[PDB]
Design a protein around this ligand. Structure first.
Ligand SMILES: *[C@@H]1O[C@H](CO[C@@H]2O[C@@H](C)[C@@H](O)[C@@H](O)[C@@H]2O)[C@@H](O[C@@H]2O[C@H](CO)[C@@H](O)[C@H](O)[C@H]2NC(C)=O)[C@H](O)[C@H]1NC(C)=O
Ligand SMILES: *[C@@H]1O[C@H](CO[C@@H]2O[C@@H](C)[C@@H](O)[C@@H](O)[C@@H]2O)[C@@H](O[C@@H]2O[C@H](CO)[C@@H](O)[C@H](O)[C@H]2NC(C)=O)[C@H](O)[C@H]1NC(C)=O
Lengths: 303, 303
């Protein structure tokens, strides 16, 4: 008889850092040798039990004269390609097997965006690119969970919880669209990678005052309110007409309240209105771009 | 240091049955191994001093750790292709060398013509084909040394001592062009091969007689002649008027003479003319296609 094999050896996908093995199922091996060589480089890997290549990750093993294995420990991208076991018959016979090496995603830092500070109303592009095999997919999300504004043309705009694409086009920006966005790159190979990108929209603080005139009967508690719209968030406080700051005490009670990143509802209560409390009170909002005040007049409702 | 080589190994043309050798000139070999494998089949030939392929014509040798040889004994067509010596470095380095195997010419007996018998006036094709590497050339010659009639169109014909081409076109044949032709196939690789091809033109024998009447004074010698044109060559003889054959004796003298394959000049002399010799004498020419005679009358010139 002549040495022949059965069943073949089959292709293998594995991904980096992991081990891999190719196996040939021979019969009637006799006095012939089974050798391996990398198909594309034509580099002899092994013959029988001897290892020829000085690639350390490469080993051989066998339990009988029937099944012969080639092992790659923690495969790399250079290891991918063909692996041929051959019997040294004349002419020689050979099985061929292909090692497919997938790689997890990794960002192209030169292409991924940084934190941006865009002016309200303009258009912005957010970019995330990652290399990997297979081709990674980039999906964008808002970190707080809200939807992303998706516009096209100039008269059609929808909303979506996520967007797929390496470049996220946000045109005609509004105050609402500020905040952290997330791009994640997934190729189906763990681990996927993400990056947090902070879209900033900045403006002067703006104060709206419902009721700039409040009437109090002596001895009651009256609340005056200011509504601030500022970005970045403003540091706020109330101030006496003379020029003295109000902080919460037994007489006063100051509070703030944020409906969003750029909205704040500041309120002050003055307990037990007296002839001493009559006058105007200013609410002041300051951020890095500027500061603005507004004045509320408190008057007495007589007898 | 790392093992490196110098000068490379160079391509080799050799031709069948002859030996061949490839050699790699390495330096700083150290503890690495030099192996050979056939490039196209990717079949491992050898590693270091061990021979892997069971092709018996393949051997290895070395005199030092500096020059390593691979030897093919009596190469065949299957041996042609690449021969790669490689060091088992990581990654491996390799020299490549190509074995060019030329083969001497050999006739394609199915295509080469046999002896032909063509009718006078028609056209004939003579064919010789031989396989070999490089492409063999076919040259035609006449075996007797004469030139070949080379015609084209129907109103232009020249002569040449030889003709190059696998097919020799002889159009509008004439009696002269009969005889052996030689085709020889030469590829520049010994030995060239030849074949003898016999172009036959056949016809009834035809006899021309200058002087069908000859006058003899008694006692003289008179010669009568017949000119025969026959193919294949005719068997000729003279015959008495009664019906008795003449052969050379003391009284008569018969001869023949061939100016070519198809021409014969037969002559008879009758010594000492006597009143007994007066009468007619017939010359007879017979070949396979037929026989023909002609009659010469011998008369006496008186007193
Ligand atoms: C292993 O897969 C190959 C497919 O070709 C490979 O595809 C990738 C894995 C990559 O490694 C490429 O470089 C390769 O080209 C299968 O090849 C087919 O095999 C059949 C049967 O032998 C043959 O008829 C087809 O023509 C082959 N197709 C190609 C494109 O070459 C091969 O069969 C697989 N091996 C096993 C054991 O299943
Ligand atoms: C040996 O010859 C090759 C020429 O290519 C071969 O040609 C025949 C001999 C046949 O074997 C074919 O199958 C081959 O393709 C030379 O190859 C050239 O090498 C130079 C320098 O390395 C390179 O720049 C050219 O591109 C090559 N040309 C081709 C067509 O591949 C080779 O260099 C010769 N070897 C030596 C040592 O001289």
């Amino acid at each position: 008889f002549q040495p022949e094999f059965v069943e073949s050896i089959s292709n293998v996908s594995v991904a980096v850092g992991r081990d891999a093995t190719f196996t040939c199922h021979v019969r009637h091996l006799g006095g012939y040798r089974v050798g391996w060589l990398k198909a594309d480089t034509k580099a002899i890997q092994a013959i029988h039990e001897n290892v020829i290549t000085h690639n350390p990750r490469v080993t051989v093993s066998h339990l009988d004269q029937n099944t012969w294995n080639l092992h790659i420990k923690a495969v790399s991208e250079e290891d991918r390609g063909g692996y041929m076991c051959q019997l040294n018959t004349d002419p020689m016979k050979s099985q061929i097997g292909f090692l497919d090496v997938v790689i997890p995603p990794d960002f192209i830092s030169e292409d991924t965006s940084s934190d941006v500070i865009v002016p309200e109303g303009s258009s912005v592009r957010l970019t995330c690119r990652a290399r990997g095999y297979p081709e990674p997919i980039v999906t964008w999300r808002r970190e707080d969970g809200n939807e992303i504004v998706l516009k096209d043309n100039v008269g059609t705009k929808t909303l979506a919880p996520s967007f797929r694409g390496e470049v996220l086009k946000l045109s005609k920006i509004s105050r609402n669209e500020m905040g952290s966005y997330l791009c994640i790159a997934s190729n189906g190979v763990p681990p996927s990678v993400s990056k947090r990108i902070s879209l900033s929209i900045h403006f002067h603080p703006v104060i709206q005052v419902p009721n700039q005139l409040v009437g109090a009967p002596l001895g009651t508690d009256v609340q005056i309110e200011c509504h601030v719209e500022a970005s970045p968030k403003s540091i706020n406080y109330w101030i006496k007409d003379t020029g003295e700051m109000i902080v919460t005490s037994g007489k006063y009670h100051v509070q703030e309240s944020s409906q969003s990143m750029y909205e704040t509802k500041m309120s002050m209560i003055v307990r037990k209105f007296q002839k001493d409390d009559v006058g105007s009170y200013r609410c002041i909002a300051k951020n890095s771009l500027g500061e603005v005040d507004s004045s509320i007049r408190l008057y007495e409702i007589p007898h």
